[PDB]
Amino acid sequence: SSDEEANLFAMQLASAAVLPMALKAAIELDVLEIMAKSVPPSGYISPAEIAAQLPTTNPEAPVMLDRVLRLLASYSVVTYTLRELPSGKVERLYGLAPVCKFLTKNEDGVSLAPFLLLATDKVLLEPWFYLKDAILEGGIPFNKAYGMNIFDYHGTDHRINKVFNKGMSSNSTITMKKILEMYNGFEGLTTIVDVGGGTGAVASMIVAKYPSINAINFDLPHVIQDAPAFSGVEHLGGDMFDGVPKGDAIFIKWICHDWSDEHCLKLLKNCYAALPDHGKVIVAEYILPPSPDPSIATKVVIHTDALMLAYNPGGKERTEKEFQALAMASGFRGFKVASCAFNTYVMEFLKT
Amino acid sequence: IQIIPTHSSDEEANLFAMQLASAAVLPMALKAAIELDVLEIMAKSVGYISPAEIAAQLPTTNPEAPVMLDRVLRLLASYSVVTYTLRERLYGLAPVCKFLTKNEDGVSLAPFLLLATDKVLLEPWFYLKDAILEGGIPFNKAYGMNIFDYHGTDHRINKVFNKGMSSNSTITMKKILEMYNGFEGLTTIVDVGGGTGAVASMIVAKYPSINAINFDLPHVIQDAPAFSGVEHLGGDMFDGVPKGDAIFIKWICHDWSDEHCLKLLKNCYAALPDHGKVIVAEYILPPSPDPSIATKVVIHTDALMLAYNPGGKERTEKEFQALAMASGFRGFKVASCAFNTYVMEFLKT
Ligand SMILES: Nc1ncnc2c1ncn2[C@@H]1O[C@H](CSCC[C@H](N)C(=O)O)[C@@H](O)[C@H]1O
Ligand SMILES: Nc1ncnc2c1ncn2[C@@H]1O[C@H](CSCC[C@H](N)C(=O)O)[C@@H](O)[C@H]1O
Ligand SMILES: COc1cc(/C=C/CO)ccc1O
Ligand SMILES: COc1cc(/C=C/CO)ccc1O
**Interchain proximity A25–B128, CB inside 8 Å:** yes
Closest alpha carbon to A74 in A22, A4, A10: A22
| Chain B residues 227-286 with a CB less than 8 Å from chain A | none
Nearest-10 crossing angle of helices A61-74, B293-308? 150
Three-state SS string over chain B comes to: CCCCCCHHHHHHHHHHHHHHHCCCHHHHHHHHHHHCCHHHHHHCCCCCECHHHHHCCCCCCCCCHHHHHHHHHHHHHHCCCEEEEECCEEEEECHHHHHCCCCCCCCCCHHHHHHHCCHHHHHHHHHHHHHHHHCCCHHHHHHCCCHHHHHCCCHHHHHHHHHHHHHHHHHHHHHHHHHCCCCCCCCEEEEECCCCCHHHHHHHHHCCCCEEEEEECHHHHCCCCCCCCEEEEECCCCCCCCCCCEEEEECCHHHECHHHHHHHHHHHHHHCCCCCEEEEEECCCCCCCCCCHHHHHHHHHHHHHHHHCCECCCCCHHHHHHHHHCCCCCEEEEEEEECCEEEEEEECC
CB proximity A107 to B under 8 Å: no
How deeply is B217 buried, as exposed, middle or buried, from its count of CB atoms within 10 A (0-12, 13-18, 19+)?
A: middle
**Which residues in chain B touch residue A11, judged by CB atoms under 8 angstroms apart?**
109, 112, 297, 300, 339
A154 a catalytic residue:
no
Q: How far is the CA of A150 from the centre of ligand 3 (A)?
A: 7
Q: What is the resolution of this structure in A?
A: 2.5
**Which residues in chain B touch residue A62, judged by CB atoms under 8 angstroms apart?**
none
CA atoms of B43 and B147, how far apart (whole Å): 35
Instruction: Looking at the CA of residue A314, tell me the nearest atom of ligand 3.
Output: 1
Which ligand has the minimum distance to the alpha carbon of residue B195?
A: 2
The domain B1-100: what is its CATH number?
1.10.10.10
CA atoms of A145 and A131, how far apart (whole Å): 10
CA atoms of B255 and B193, how far apart (whole Å): 11
CA atoms of B32 and A144, how far apart (whole Å): 15
Rounded to a whole number of angstroms, the CA Rg of chain A reads 23
Exposure class string for A175-188: b at 16+ Cβ within 10 A, else e: bbebbbeebebbee
Closest alpha carbon to B115 in B235, B251, B238: B251
CB B263 within 8 A of CB B206: no
Question: How big is the CA angle at A133 (ends A130 and A139), to the nearest 5 degrees?
Answer: 85
CB proximity A303 to B under 8 Å: yes
φ, ψ for residue A292, nearest 5 deg: -75, 55
CA atoms of A70 and A85, how far apart (whole Å): 18
Closest alpha carbon to B341 in B250, B205, B212: B250
Interface test with A, best of B9, B11, B132 (most A CBs within 10 A): B132
CA atoms of A321 and A299, how far apart (whole Å): 20
Binding residues of A for S-adenosyl-L-methionine: 172, 196-197, 219, 239-240, 253
A1-103 folds as: Arc Repressor Mutant, subunit A (1.10.10)
Catalytic residue among A158, A222, A235, A257: A257
Rounded to a whole number of angstroms, the CA Rg of chain B reads 22
DSSP conformation class of A277: T
Exposure class string for B123-146: b at 16+ Cβ within 10 A, else e: bbbbbbbbbbbeeebbbbbbbeee
CB proximity B179 to A under 8 Å: no
CB B16 within 8 A of CB A300: no
DSSP conformation class of A45: B
Q: Which of B112, B288, B318 sits opposite A82 (nearest CB)?
A: B288
CB A124 within 8 A of CB A157: no
Cα–Cα distances (Å) from B342 to A180, B106, B175, B189, B316, in that order, read 56, 25, 11, 19, 11
B101-349: which CATH number, 3.40.50.150, 2.60.120.1440, 1.10.260.40, 3.30.70.100? Answer: 3.40.50.150
- Positive/negative CA dihedral, B319, B323, B324, B330: positive
**Which residues in chain B touch residue A67, judged by CB atoms under 8 angstroms apart?**
302-303, 306, 313
CA atoms of A130 and A310, how far apart (whole Å): 8
DSSP conformation class of A259: B
| Chain A residues 61-80 with a CB less than 8 Å from chain B | 61, 64-65, 67-68, 70-71, 73-77, 80
CA atoms of A29 and B133, how far apart (whole Å): 8
Closest alpha carbon to B346 in B289, B282, B296, B260: B282
The one-letter amino acid at A120:
T
SS3 state of residue A95? strand
Closest alpha carbon to B247 in B177, B323, B191: B191
**Interchain proximity B289–A71, CB inside 8 Å:** yes
Method: X-ray
Exposure class string for A191-219: b at 16+ Cβ within 10 A, else e: bbbbbbbbbbbbbbbbbeebeebbbbbbb
Cα–Cα distances (Å) from A98 to A102, A137, B13, in that order, read 8, 44, 6
For residue B299, give every residue at least 6 positions away whose Cβ sits within 8 Å of its Cβ, in sequence order, or none: A70, A71, A74, B289, B314
Which ligand has the minimum distance to the alpha carbon of residue B304?
A: 4
CB proximity B49 to A under 8 Å: no
**Interchain proximity A65–B132, CB inside 8 Å:** yes
In terms of DSSP bridges, do strands B188-192 and B246-250 run parallel, antiparallel, or are they unpaired?
A: parallel
Cα–Cα distances (Å) from A201 to A107, A112, A155, A224, A233, in that order, read 16, 14, 20, 12, 10
Q: Look at chain A and count its residues.
A: 352
Catalytic residue among B151, B232, B254, B260: B254
CB A7 within 8 A of CB A50: no
CB proximity B291 to A under 8 Å: yes
For residue B270, give every residue at least 6 positions away whose Cβ sits within 8 Å of its Cβ, in sequence order, or none: B240, B241
Domain boundaries, chain A: 1-103, 104-352
**Interchain proximity A6–B117, CB inside 8 Å:** no
Residue nearest to atom 15 of ligand 2 (CA): B251
Residue A91: enclosing H or E segment and its boundaries? strand A90-96
Determine the longest span between alpha carbons in chain A, in angstroms: 79
CA atoms of B334 and B341, how far apart (whole Å): 11
φ, ψ for residue A315, nearest 5 deg: -75, 155
CB A12 within 8 A of CB B300: yes
**Interchain proximity B289–A137, CB inside 8 Å:** no
Residues in chain B whose C lies over 2.5 Å from the next residue's N (breaks after): 46, 87
A104-352 folds as: Rossmann fold (3.40.50)
Closest alpha carbon to A251 in A287, A200, A313: A200
Q: How far is the CA of A168 from the centre of ligand 1 (A)?
A: 10
CA atoms of A30 and A156, how far apart (whole Å): 28
Q: Where do runs of H (alpha helix) occur along chain A? A: 3-14, 18-28, 33-37, 47-51, 61-74, 100-103, 113-119, 122-125, 131-137, 141-145, 150-154, 158-182, 201-209, 221-224, 261-274, 296-311, 320-329
CB B43 within 8 A of CB B93: yes
CB proximity A130 to B under 8 Å: no
For residue A199, give every residue at least 6 positions away whose Cβ sits within 8 Å of its Cβ, in sequence order, or none: A165, A166, A168, A169, A217, A219, A223, A226, A227, A228
CB B192 within 8 A of CB B237: yes
**Interchain proximity A21–B19, CB inside 8 Å:** no
Closest alpha carbon to B23 in A104, A299, A127, A144: A299
Exposure class string for A243-281: b at 16+ Cβ within 10 A, else e: ebbebbbbbbbbbbbbbebebbebbbebbbebbeeebbb
Q: Is A118 in the pocket of ligand 3 (CB under 6 A)?
A: yes
For residue B59, give every residue at least 6 positions away whose Cβ sits within 8 Å of its Cβ, in sequence order, or none: A136
φ, ψ for residue B275, nearest 5 deg: -95, 25
Ligand 4 pocket, CB under 6 A: A 14-15; B 115-116, 121, 147, 161, 255, 304, 308-309
> Count of alpha carbons within 13 Å of B246, Cβ hemisphere only?
22
SS3 state of residue A209? helix
**Interchain proximity A25–B303, CB inside 8 Å:** no
